[PDB]
Amino acid sequence: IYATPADPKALLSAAVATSQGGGKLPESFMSLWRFPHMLENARGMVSQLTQFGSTLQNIIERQDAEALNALLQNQAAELILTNLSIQDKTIEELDAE
Amino acid sequence: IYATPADPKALLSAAVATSQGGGKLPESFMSLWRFPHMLENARGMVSQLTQFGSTLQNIIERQDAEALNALLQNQAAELILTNLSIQDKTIEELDAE
Amino acid sequence: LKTQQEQTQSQLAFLQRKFSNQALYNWLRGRLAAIYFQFYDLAVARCLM
Amino acid sequence: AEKFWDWLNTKYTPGSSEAVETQEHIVQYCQALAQLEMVYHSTGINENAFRLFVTKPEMFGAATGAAPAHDALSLIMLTRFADWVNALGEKASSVLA
Amino acid sequence: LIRKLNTITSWLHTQKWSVFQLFIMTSTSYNKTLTPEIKNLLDTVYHGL
Amino acid sequence: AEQAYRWELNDDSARFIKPGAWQGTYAGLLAGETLMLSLAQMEDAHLK
């Protein structure tokens, strides 16, 4: 009776999420400025905070594009070792021929 | 008589459009400010709304670039299972040879 | 080919575990489209003012 | 969904890892929402007919005034409906409208 | 009952699904365990609404 | 700015800056877009 190998199984990876707790607001402070001047002051901070958030978002995208890029070259360096050993068996076959 | 299989049919996908209803304007409000000061106030809001729309457009592009990227890797993971079974028949052929 | 299967799985595991994955941009789009619509009603309000 | 917001507005503290008295019923509601998300992506039905299947189940063969089913006999007809729409091709919008 | 099993089992082969994948979409029994995915859903709908 | 809003108008129960603009699980992204909406709700409430 002839040994048939089993079907190749599917690999499976788990992606769990993380969760960080919601913070709380600081204590409010009563400044000297009236509302139109303090709103314009607060809008200048929040506009700067959006520019940090757009910059931070681009850095996160760009570290994941380069973590992937280093992953693809390490995988290409490991895969070429097998093809070197396959090509050795090609040359060894022609010596047997 | 020899059985000839039929020609491979073309797959076909339907892309329907969606349609959302046009909204209505809010009730107008008569503020205290004159027109050059209220126009400059309204231009500050609309300029901020354009910056949200450019940011939202980039996020839509970037979720579709990564929904595609996860699609291409799931397709590559399903396709490699067939090549594993093809390579098993290559080894089984050399055992028959 | 078993290496390439494991290498495909490592790229698939990387796309799911990285921070800028699809679940980030579903969160960013869903939250910003809620902000952008509410900010729309505020700016049309002052265009009418 | 009304009960769900009454629980969040009263009894849920974000970031706190504690036991709320009806927390496990909320989890089962959120586990359900993820289930029906999976129903939409797996059947391949489009966006506007999935409105129609939720709101008017009788138009898809359910009984009158009946809540729809994610039964396996109801998942197979959503797939056969989505295969029917995709076979219509570019005239699929005119048929579904 | 056999025609219902014959229809669905043949359908699961064309969809290339498992019974285990089918049962996830079909089960009315839900797990009552607060995951980080649900906890992110609770924090977003709380702060959003 | 909310304390200035609460002092130019007699109200202390009226709050616009609410917690959760920072979501730590999403690295605090869109925190400024959340606050800029909240500043636009004070100014709209101030004008009216």
Side-chain angles (χ1 to χ4, degrees), chain E residues 12-31:
Chain E
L12 289 171
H13 293 297
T14 64
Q15 298 298 314
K16 197 187 286 185
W17 293 349
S18 297
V19 179
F20 295 141
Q21 295 182 0
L22 178 62
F23 186 73
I24 295 168
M25 288 178 283
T26 312
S27 176
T28 316
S29 296
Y30 298 109
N31 198 1

Side-chain angles (χ1 to χ4, degrees), chain D residues 5-64:
Chain D
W5 173 246
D6 293 335
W7 185 74
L8 287 174
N9 200 7
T10 301
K11 293 182 181 178
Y12 178 72
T13 302
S16 296
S17 65
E18 291 182 357
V20 190
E21 65 179 6
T22 173
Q23 184 181 4
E24 291 177 353
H25 302 297
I26 299 295
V27 174
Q28 286 178 347
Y29 180 72
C30 297
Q31 283 289 324
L33 294 176
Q35 190 192 20
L36 305 160
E37 186 267 340
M38 185 178 175
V39 168
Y40 174 72
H41 293 291
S42 297
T43 57
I45 193 169
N46 51 0
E47 184 173 1
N48 197 8
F50 187 66
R51 301 285 301 176
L52 186 61
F53 182 56
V54 173
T55 58
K56 293 182 180 179
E58 296 89 4
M59 195 171 288
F60 284 85
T64 173

Side-chain angles (χ1 to χ4, degrees), chain B:
Chain B
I1 192 65
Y2 291 161
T4 303
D7 288 331
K9 65 180 182 181
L11 295 176
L12 181 60
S13 297
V16 307
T18 64
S19 181
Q20 292 293 111
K24 66 181 74 175
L25 292 175
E27 185 184 3
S28 298
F29 180 74
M30 181 65 203
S31 64
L32 276 71
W33 294 94
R34 291 178 178 174
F35 180 75
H37 295 271
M38 197 64 211
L39 178 69
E40 192 270 333
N41 193 1
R43 197 183 299 275
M45 290 292 287
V46 174
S47 177
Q48 186 63 44
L49 199 151
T50 56
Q51 294 182 359
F52 287 171
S54 297
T55 304
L56 179 63
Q57 181 180 355
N58 291 322
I59 292 171
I60 291 170
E61 297 174 0
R62 186 62 180 165
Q63 77 162 355
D64 290 333
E66 293 184 357
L68 177 62
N69 196 3
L71 180 64
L72 294 180
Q73 294 297 317
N74 288 315
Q75 287 180 354
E78 291 174 352
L79 192 64
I80 196 65
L81 289 176
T82 307
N83 296 324
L84 282 169
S85 64
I86 292 169
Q87 189 62 37
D88 291 334
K89 300 295 178 68
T90 300
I91 300 168
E92 185 178 357
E93 179 191 359
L94 294 177
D95 291 333
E97 288 291 325

Side-chain angles (χ1 to χ4, degrees), chain A residues 18 20 25 29 35 43 46, chain F residues 1 3 8 17 25 32 43 46:
Chain A
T18 64
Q20 292 293 111
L25 292 175
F29 180 74
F35 180 75
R43 197 183 299 274
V46 174
Chain F
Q3 292 300 109
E8 185 172 355
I17 311 299
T25 167
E43 187 177 3
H46 189 214

Side-chain angles (χ1 to χ4, degrees), chain C:
Chain C
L1 289 175
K2 287 185 287 184
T3 300
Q4 297 177 6
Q5 187 190 8
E6 185 175 0
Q7 287 180 356
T8 299
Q9 195 65 38
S10 293
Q11 303 174 12
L12 184 60
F14 176 74
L15 294 179
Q16 294 172 355
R17 287 188 174 96
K18 65 179 181 179
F19 185 76
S20 65
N21 51 359
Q22 185 181 359
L24 176 67
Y25 294 105
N26 289 119
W27 186 77
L28 288 176
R29 185 202 58 81
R31 188 180 176 87
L32 183 58
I35 292 172
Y36 176 62
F37 178 71
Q38 294 177 0
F39 198 85
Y40 172 75
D41 296 333
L42 299 173
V44 174
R46 298 182 199 174
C47 290
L48 291 171
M49 287 177 188

